[PDB]
Amino acid sequence: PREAAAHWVPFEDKANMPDNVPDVVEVGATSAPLLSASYFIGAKCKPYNDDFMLCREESQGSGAIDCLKEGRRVTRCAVSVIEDINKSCLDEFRLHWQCLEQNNHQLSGCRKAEALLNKCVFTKLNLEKKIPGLRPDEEPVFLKKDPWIKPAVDDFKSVRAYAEAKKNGTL
């Protein structure tokens, strides 16, 4: 909660989780893949994440040890989402998060690869990207045409792929 300052020393511990806790696959995705697939892991794994945080609320200060069984399932279902999005559109997912590698991981600077990825995942993985808390007669911001805030440099691969998807008629 507070930052380490004044000569902090990093240390690691070679040790293992005990016998009674089963093993769990951990997420190997990085900040641009994770920020890319954030909306789709939030769309598929809403009740599991909600179960985890609601358990952690109900057992106060228990915290760590007593809702471990449910933090298993949130990691498992998000790994399921990212495996499925790899096998579905590895190329356009890659186009998206390689765009997000530049521009400070700003989501504002990568709209034209984001449209391709959202179409490809809604077509095949059939998850939709939505923003809740947004009452009607308020346009969602990744749908609007001529935004005020445009990126400095459109990346070249996604402009070319966006024009090719115009020409194919899939868009």
């Binding site: 930052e3 020393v9 990093p10 190997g28 995705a29 990085t30 900040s31 790899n86 590698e101 400070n104």
Partner: protein, 86 residues
């Protein structure tokens, strides 16, 4: 009309700041490894950059994408030990 001798030291100042900014951007991109700087870093973003440096293995922002993380990944987790602050 316009005197070139007046604008010639301004041509120097313009060229020195221009070559300075260009050489600096090339040094920043060579430091990151082919990509741009991160110009404003949150606490969330700083923890996330540390996590990525733990994920990829050694390199700064290699930005790997794998389904399932490796096996040294569960064990290379670090805690930060801060001194007494007297």
């Amino acid at each position: 009309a316009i005197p070139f001798e007046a604008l010639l030291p301004y041509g120097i100042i313009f060229g020195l700041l221009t070559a300075g900014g260009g050489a600096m951007q090339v040094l920043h991109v060579y430091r990151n490894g082919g990509v741009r700087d991160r110009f404003a870093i949150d606490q969330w973003d700083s923890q996330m950059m540390e996590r990525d440096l733990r994920l990829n293995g050694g390199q700064g922002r290699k930005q790997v994408d794998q389904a399932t993380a490796p096996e040294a990944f569960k064990h290379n987790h670090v805690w930060k030990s801060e001194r007494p602050l007297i």
